[PDB]
C-alpha cells in the first residue's frame, strides 16, 4: 500500500510548487518597486541638478555685477578724496595768507 | 617658496604691471600677517627700485607697502634711514596726486620710526638746498620728528636746524613759510623762551606772526 | 497506475528545481536593484548637501558685497558734503580778502 | 497698509528713536521707488514730518529733513499751498545747534529753493530778510538768490521795489556771510536785468559798488 504514499508525495510537491509561485510573484513585485524607486530618484536628481544650475548661474551674474559696482564706487571715492584734499590745502593756504595780512 | 615666486615676479622692471600689482598686494598681505629676518633687504631694494617705475599706481602701492613695513618693523631701517628718507622726499615731487598722497603717508609713518637725530641731521641740508616741494616735505617731516625728541638733543641740534627754518621763512613759496612757522612752533613747544635768542635777527612782523600762532597752539 | 504517478513525480520535481533556480536569480536581481537604489540615493543626498553649501557661500559673498556697496556709497556722500563745506569755506575766505583789499587799498 | 503702519510708527514724537529712524528710512526708500498713494496720503506725511522737526532728538530732525528733501525732489507739486509754512519751518531749522541738522537743512533749503513757486517765495522772504535773526536771514537770502535764478525778467522787474530794501540794508549788516550773500543776490539780479539795476543802487558807497562790480566781472567769466 505504498501507492497512497506516492499520491501524498505528489500532493506535497504540488503544494510546494504553488507556494514557490506565490513567493516568486512577490519577489517580482519587489523588483518592480525598486525599479520605480530608481526612476523617481532619477527624476529628483534631474530637477535638483537643473534648478541648482540655473540658480548658480544667476547668482554668478549678480555677483560679478556687484563687483563692478564696488570697483567703480571706490574709484569715485578715491577721486573725491583727492578733490577734498586739494580744497583743504586751498583753505589752509588762504587762511595762512589772511593771518599774514591781518598782522 | 611662496614669497620667492612673488619676488621673482617683482624682478620684471617696467613690465607685467598687473602681475606685479598682485605680487605687491600679496606681500602687503603677508606684512599684515619672521621671514623678514632673512629676506628683508632684497625686498627693500626692489621697493626702492619700484619708486622709479613708469607706472604711477605701482609706485603708490609700493609706497603703501613701504608704509606697512615701516609701521610693522621700524628697527630694520636703522642702517638705511638716510637713503629711505632721500627716496621718499624725492618721491614727493611726483606729478601724480595719489602718489604724492601715498608718499606723504609713507613719510608720515617714516617720521615716527626712524632715529630722530640722524633724521634731523640728514634733513637739514635738504631744507637748505632742495627744490619745492621736497624742501617742504622735509620741513614737515622735521616737525614730526621734532615732536619726538628730548629737550637736550634738540638743544644740541638747534644751531644746525635754525638757519634752514629762517631761510625757509624767507622763501617765496607760501607753503614753505607756513611749514617753517609750524616747525618753529614745535620747537617752542619743547624749549620755550630759549628759542628767542636764536631769533634776534628776525623782523618784528614775522615775530608777531609767530607769537600769534604760538598763542593759537597754547589754547 | 503506479508508473503514471512516478512519471508525474519526476516531472513535478523538475518543475520544482527550475523554480528554485529561477527564484535565486530573481533574488540576485533584487540585490542588484537594491544596491542601485542605495547608490542613487547617496548621489541625491550628496547633490542636495553640496548644492546647499555652495548656495550658502554664494549668498554670503553676495551680502558682504552688498554691505560694502552700501557703506561705500554712504562714505561717498559724506565725502561730497565735506567737499562742499571746504569749497564754500574757500569762497568765504576769498570774499574777506577782496573786502579787506577794498578797505585798505 | 504698509504706509499706514509706517505712519503709525512716525506718530510717536520724541519717543522710539530707533524704530522711527527705521520708519523714516523705509519712507525714503519707498519714496525712491507708489506714485498715486500720495494723492490720498501726502498731507498727513508732511504734517508728521514738520511736527518731527521739533523733536528733542537731533538725528531724528536731520533725518526728517533729508526725507523732506527727497519728497521735495520727487513730487514737488503737492507743496503748492503749503510753501510759506515749509519755508518758515526749514529756515527755523537752520538755527539748530547741531551741525548735521543745519547741513541737512541747507540741502533741503537748496532743493526747496529749486522747487517752490518763485513769486510767492520772494514775497514771503522779503520781511524775513528784513527781520529774522542770524542765521535765518542768511539762509533766506541764499534761497531768494536761488529763486531769482528762476524768475523772468518782467516778474523780477515788477518785484524789485520789494526785493531791494532788504538787500541794501542787509549789505550794511555786520555778519560777513550776510554781506556776501547780498552781493551774490545782487549779482543774480544783475544777471537778469543788467544795466537797468544801476539806478536802484544809488544809495551804496563807492567801496561796496567796487566789491559788487568785482563779483559781477567774476560771474561773467
UniProtKB/Swiss-Prot annotation, chain B:
Natural source organism:
Homo sapiens
Q: How does it assemble?
A: Interacts with microtubules. Interacts with MAPRE1; probably required for targeting to the growing microtubule plus ends. Interacts with CLIP2, ERC1, MAPRE3, PHLDB2 and RSN. The interaction with ERC1 may be mediated by PHLDB2. Interacts with GCC2; recruits CLASP2 to Golgi membranes. Interacts with MACF1. Interacts with mtcl2 and MTCL1.
Q: Where are the HEAT repeats?
A: 1-33, 38-75, 156-193
**Originating gene:** CLASP2
Question: Entire protein: which part is shown?
Answer: 1058 to 1279 of 1294
Name assigned to this protein: CLIP-associating protein 2
Region Required for cortical localization: start and end of each range?
Answer: 1-219
What family, per the record? Belongs to the CLASP family.
Q: Where in the cell is it found?
A: Cytoplasm, Cytoskeleton; Cytoplasm, Cytoskeleton, Microtubule organizing center, Centrosome; Chromosome, Centromere, Kinetochore; Cytoplasm, Cytoskeleton, Spindle
What note about domains is in the entry?
The two SXIP sequence motifs mediate interaction with MAPRE1; this is necessary for targeting to growing microtubule plus ends. Two TOG regions display structural characteristics similar to HEAT repeat domains and mediate interaction with microtubules.
* Tissue-wise expression: Brain-specific.
Post-translational modifications: Phosphorylated by GSK3B. Phosphorylation reduces MAPRE1 binding. Phosphorylation by GSK3B may negatively regulate binding to microtubule lattices in lamella.
Question: What this chain does, per the record?
Answer: Microtubule plus-end tracking protein that promotes the stabilization of dynamic microtubules. Involved in the nucleation of noncentrosomal microtubules originating from the trans-Golgi network (TGN). Required for the polarization of the cytoplasmic microtubule arrays in migrating cells towards the leading edge of the cell. May act at the cell cortex to enhance the frequency of rescue of depolymerizing microtubules by attaching their plus-ends to cortical platforms composed of ERC1 and PHLDB2.
